[PDB]
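Input record (Table S2, row 950):
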Amino acid sequence: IETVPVKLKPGMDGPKVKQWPLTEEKIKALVEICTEMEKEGKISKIGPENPYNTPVFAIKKKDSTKWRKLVDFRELNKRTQDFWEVQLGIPHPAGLKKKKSVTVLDVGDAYFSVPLDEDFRKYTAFTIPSINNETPGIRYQYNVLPQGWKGSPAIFQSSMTKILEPFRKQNPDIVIYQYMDDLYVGSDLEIGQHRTKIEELRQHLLRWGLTGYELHPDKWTVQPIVLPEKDSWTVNDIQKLVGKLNWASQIYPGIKVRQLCKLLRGTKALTEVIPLTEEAELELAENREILKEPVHGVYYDPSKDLIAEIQKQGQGQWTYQIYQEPFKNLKTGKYARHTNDVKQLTEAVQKITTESIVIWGKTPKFKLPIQKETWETWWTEYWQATWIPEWEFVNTPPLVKLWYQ
Amino acid sequence: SPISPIETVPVKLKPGMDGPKVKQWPLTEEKIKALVEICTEMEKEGKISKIGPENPYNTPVFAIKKKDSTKWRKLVDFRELNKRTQDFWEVQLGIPHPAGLKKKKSVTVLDVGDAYFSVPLDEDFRKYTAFTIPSINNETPGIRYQYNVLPQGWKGSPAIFQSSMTKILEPFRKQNPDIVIYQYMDDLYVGSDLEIGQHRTKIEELRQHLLRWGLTTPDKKHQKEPPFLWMGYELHPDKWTVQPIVLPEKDSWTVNDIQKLVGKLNWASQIYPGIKVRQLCKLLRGTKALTEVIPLTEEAELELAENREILKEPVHGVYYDPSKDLIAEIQKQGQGQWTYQIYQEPFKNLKTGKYARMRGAHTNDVKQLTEAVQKITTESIVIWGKTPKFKLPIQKETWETWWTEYWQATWIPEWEFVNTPPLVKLWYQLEKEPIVGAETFYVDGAANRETKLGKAGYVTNRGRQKVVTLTDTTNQKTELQAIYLALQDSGLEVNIVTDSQYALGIIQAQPDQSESELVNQIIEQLIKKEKVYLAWVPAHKGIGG
Ligand SMILES: Cc1ccc2c(c1)CCCN2C(=O)SCC(=O)Nc1ccc(S(N)(=O)=O)cc1Cl
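Output record (RT3 complex):
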């Protein structure tokens, strides 16, 4: 198989990302995996003349005992993006998010039998570190298309197509979107039919080598920010009430407050129950009305990063919003719970990433309510996805927390 | 010394760049003479070789005597070629911690003469290693030369050499798992738990392996004896430690004396539990010259004392035992200073350490303590490949209270309360609900961006009121000031309604010590209080307040 030639982006060159301290159990796992891949000719030891580096971790994946290797190409992917995206970019079916059932199938194996352009390999260097730095890490590079590299699916697209062609012809109402190492298969069938069709599809794959996740999009919807209902209202509640209302306009056009407001005025005691005028009962209502609606005015700009912010709300529950432009939400939902905070944040992040892949075909940049170090040390304990999105660490505004509670 | 029949590492200059071509400066005759002398010596050994002036490349050469001695050393100034050579793979990117070495029956040190000069250099590369010994003054063509081995002070020498060393050892390891070799610079630490006998055998069997490869080394009666000095440590058969520390006695201290002192102490605190340093540091801030003498504070002096106390008579650390567990215990030692110990059997430390930094402007103890835990957790994974069981001066409950209602996600691995004062606590809760029958202050604070003056004040709901003026402030400062007033004129319980997300944020955090003075007062208030409930609202959307 003569190889498709791969360029970097002009004026920049490969990644040199530091590797992360890894725990013994993971290092062992990686030494096995990497022995076996070397045998299979997938990767080859390299010499000090490769300065490049990409971090590498081991995960386990939902309901699997088997350690599995996970390379972090986030840096490489930005340094190639011209190739994988604008140059060999996979179109995105707005249809996918409508279907009643989306099964998600791991397809990383595909790649493993396409050679990597010879002059690109050096870019895929990784290291297996050793405890206490007692021995220099084992350094490798890939000979075949690596998983988690955004180039891999791009290159491997036309094979994918041939592979998928017949099944596609025979079931013209099943959407199949590929994003990286996964295939998203969406159908409108009774679930059993669906499952059958998935199995049926597995056979096709299984004839070129290939070899779960059951999602039901169409039944994703609002999360209308909720204004307490109730007879009686302390100043506090009304205070807390306007406050929350206050937040909502800015993203919600038409919101209304001042009516509710004049209920306030003068230094009354907080814990003081107070009469309620019933036109100000209308704002309440018609805000409530709107408050369940989409933001009128907000569209997804395919030329612009997505961002996803996450807030913590005790009781094992977290809120989150996706948008491209502060306050103009494309979407906003919630997650609910032996789980700790981090374990949870990690599950949440994957959940959202994956919704996000299905809706837009790209992954958001996360703003996480956690300490950089902590997230870093801990997240691989729970990570089960084959991709890794982008993240930062931030200090939830005190009030953002409630306006969403 | 031989020259390795081994493979070769293909080097390369940076893309779109060419070799070096720097002119050779005129040299004195004696210098010129030494070079001729040195080179023909080297050249006799194939280390280097004669070339033409057809080869268009040149790097300069120099030659100096040697401190006091009566010999001559050749200097090559690779700067330029170094600056045109491809980047390599960082050499050794961590260094073992004694605390992590698994103890061994017997270990000996092998080193290696002609480190770099025993290993070949990619051939197509040598061309660029061109240099020239010039002819007495201007006249004549100088003599031209280039490298066959790895030149000293060239960019790739350290990587390639360490790489080679690794390729070589590879086999001998395979056929000897029970044996451990630590490569360092050009030294070899080798150890096993086999009896004095086949050790030296095994060693010799190594010195041979190294010979079949052009690597020559000391033989018994030449290699050093325990304790090995290395990287600042003292490594004995049983324990390890930092190297002899001498904290001198003097009357005057300069900014220099104190810096050096702080450094020695920090280094010593790896294994000397208790070492303190913050008084000494204060002395350093907003600083004059290096030669400047700083009068030791009295507190500072107590430190200097309490430190010599600890350092008076030795402490050692034990090695690591992959089988048993890791326990880490932390103590609060004072103003944002924490100190810890790790060991596997009650009180034989594998190491000690300290944590101080101040993450944030306002923080509380519980926060600080979990930062330590993380910092200790990482250091641990690096060193032992696993996280230790912790013992902390905080009740499970205090900890459960804080994490529970903290905006940020958080998470300590396994731990157990241990009762060693000071204990860590929250110094005040804040109400969940408004307080029935207790004054409601509506406070506010403003500041003229120009005059920079501000009014700060409040108006409660038993119609009381105050106002104040502030000469050089900001909005932020004013709003802390209001909440401060309202907290002062209200005794035991009070509700406060600010529209300052800023102040609110800070106080919802339960700070308990703060860079800001004003915030610290608010804190002394907050502890005196008995029931405070604080609440926010938007302003200019002007409201009941
Ligand atoms: C720099 C350095 C120092 C030391 C070591 C390494 C690297 C890696 C190999 C292991 N290693 C050791 O020295 S640990 C072995 C140990 O517990 N200490 C020890 C045991 C026996 C002996 S003995 N019997 O005198 O040879 C000497 C020592 Cl210093």
